[PDB]
Design a protein. Structure first.
Lengths: 535, 50
């Protein structure tokens, strides 16, 4: 055997991590990630500035976006990035509490590794302890589906005001909660209800103030009209309040085949015949709209210079250069069908709009199309304003997370009381079963119960309360009294009851917090050999 | 003269060891066992189970 020793390619950049110090490095590294967002949990939480390599900055406290678009090195914290993305995609809320709980499971398991217990035996006790915590909270979980639609409307307000308290939108929770709830009510079926988030759109605008944000049912388009001199507001005349909105994927252009073609013209005779040909096409295109009674016509490609004024003399507004995706969302709210060709134009495919006016913003040059419906329609659109470009984007993610909490109550009406009440209720259930079974799994159960206590102690630490006096008070009322409504109060009211404070959280959101955290740390404890290649 | 369905269940739980399924094997084994029964006994394909 000579000096060169080579088996795996690139042995210099690839390093091998092993031993007891390997588990100590990856567990303590994941704690530093949760320690950053530890102060961001709850309504007292604080935001985080994110700087992109291109220079764009974003300020958000949401753990999903914080871990996103961030440069990382260690692969353990990169799993936490995908952890918050998993919580954000399906549920849409609770991305901060999952990473904190995931690091709490590793910190409690770190002391158990040094005691001589196999890492898998530590993780095997977490799966059995997580099932006992879910079964305990499910028994005390109240079902609000027994009420009518009148009391159900106020139930969605309790779930919306809780998630909006940790954002900049928390300034007024009452006024901005109606925008999220009423937007969902329009798409609800009243029976076997599905949210169908696709019908809900969110369009932000940078300017003004956040108090000017209002819920408008319709489609928001930033494309100005084809001609400047047409009237800004469009109103129906006499009966038939519908404006007969027509959506045509084919603009006004000289007819030509898609394939390459060559038109041969012979001298003067055929040259003059084609002159009248196109002149009769513009007269044919305008007669089809007047026959069906359509008014506003939108299309993908801009109209010709001759077609712009042709629609003005007939009092027929038009909008050009509209995206393909924007064409489909308009026909749904108007109960219309997109007209594929000029020969298929009919009154049955025409849309309906209550009022359409041309919006203008300050000294800048832009025109925003606003479609309104005097009656309940199929789609809704969120209109958000703000004094800063980042406040607008932050209000988008704040309102998006609010819509994700409301949709969780549509599929599953079962809800729980958060704010430290749910974590302590599920924590004491594991401690009671640890002393009964005893054995070698009693240490894995106590580590899971103490890890659940990190969430209520975090809410009390950021709010200034003493974590020692807060945790001891919760366990006294939870063990003596069967009422689980007692929880951590971050705002400092004279009562610790979460029911009187109108704090309601979905059960599917709090259930995935333990599920995603327990399943992730089980694989982390199974990681021994770590091969990292330098880039 | 035992049942053919219970034969594939005990053999599937063995391969679930050393993986993350060992704790969750209750629900997951009942899936893959029903996956091979849908395929024809004469022709078994790994692309259809993708």
């Amino acid at each position: 055997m000579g000096r060169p020793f080579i088996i795996v390619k690139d042995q210099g950049n690839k390093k091998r991590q092993h031993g007891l110090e390997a588990k100590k490095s990856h567990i303590l590294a994941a704690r530093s990630v949760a320690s950053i967002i530890k102060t961001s949990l709850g309504p007292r939480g604080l935001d985080k500035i994110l700087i992109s390599p291109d220079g764009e900055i974003t300020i958000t406290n949401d753990g999903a976006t914080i871990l996103s678009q961030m440069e990382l090195d260690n692969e353990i914290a990169k799993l936490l990035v995908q952890l918050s993305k998993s919580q954000d995609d399906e549920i849409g809320d609770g991305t901060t509490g999952v990473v904190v709980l995931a690091s709490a499971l590793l910190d409690q398991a770190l002391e158990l590794i040094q005691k001589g217990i196999h890492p898998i035996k530590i993780a095997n006790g977490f799966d059995e302890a997580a099932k006992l915590a879910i079964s305990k909270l499910e028994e005390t979980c109240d079902d609000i589906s027994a009420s009518n639609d009148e009391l159900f409307r106020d139930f969605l307000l309790r779930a919306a005001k809780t998630s909006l308290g940790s954002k900049i939108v928390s300034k007024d929770h009452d006024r901005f909660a109606e925008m999220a709830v009423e937007a969902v009510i329009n798409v609800m079926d009243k029976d076997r209800k599905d949210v169908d988030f696709d019908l809900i759109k969110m369009q932000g605008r940078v300017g003004g103030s956040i108090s000017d944000s209002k819920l408008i049912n319709g489609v928001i388009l930033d494309k100005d009209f084809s001609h400047p001199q047409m009237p800004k507001c469009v109103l129906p005349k006499e009966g038939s309040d519908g404006v007969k909105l027509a959506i045509l994927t084919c603009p006004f252009e000289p007819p030509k085949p898609k394939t390459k073609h060559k038109l041969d013209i012979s001298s003067v005779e055929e040259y003059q015949k084609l002159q009248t040909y196109e002149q009769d096409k513009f007269k044919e295109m305008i007669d089809d709209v007047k026959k069906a009674g359509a008014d506003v016509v939108i299309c993908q490609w801009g109209f010709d210079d001759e077609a712009n004024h042709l629609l003005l003399q007939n009092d027929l507004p038009a909008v050009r250069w509209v995206g393909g995706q924007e064409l489909e969302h308009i026909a749904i709210s108007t109960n219309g069908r997109i007209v594929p060709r000029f020969q298929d134009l009919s009154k049955d495919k025409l849309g309906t709009c209550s009022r359409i006016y041309e919006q203008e913003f300050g000294t800048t040059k832009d025109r925003m199309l606003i479609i309104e419906q005097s009656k309940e329609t199929k789609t809704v659109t969120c209109f958000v304003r703000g004094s800063n470009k980042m406040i607008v984007d932050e209000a988008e993610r704040a309102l998006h997370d609010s819509l994700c909490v409301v949709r969780n109550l549509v599929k599953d009406s079962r809800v729980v009381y958060g704010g430290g009440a749910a974590e302590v209720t599920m924590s004491l259930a594991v401690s009671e079963e640890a002393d009964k079974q005893r054995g070698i799994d009693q240490y894995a159960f106590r580590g899971f119960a103490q890890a659940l206590d990190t969430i209520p102690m975090t809410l009390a630490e950021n709010s200034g309360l003493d974590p020692i006096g807060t945790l001891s008070t919760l366990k006294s009322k939870q063990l003596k009294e069967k009422i689980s409504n007692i929880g951590v109060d971050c705002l400092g009211y004279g009562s610790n009851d979460m029911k009187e404070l109108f704090v309601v959280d979905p059960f599917i959101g709090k259930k995935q917090q333990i599920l995603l955290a327990t399943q992730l740390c089980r694989m982390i404890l199974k990681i021994d050999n770590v091969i990292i290649s330098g880039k | 003269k035992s049942s053919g369905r219970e034969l594939l269940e005990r053999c599937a739980r063995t391969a679930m060891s050393s993986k993350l399924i060992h704790n969750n094997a209750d629900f997951f084994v009942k899936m893959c066992v029903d996956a091979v029964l849908s395929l024809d006994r004469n022709d078994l394909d790994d692309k259809l189970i993708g």
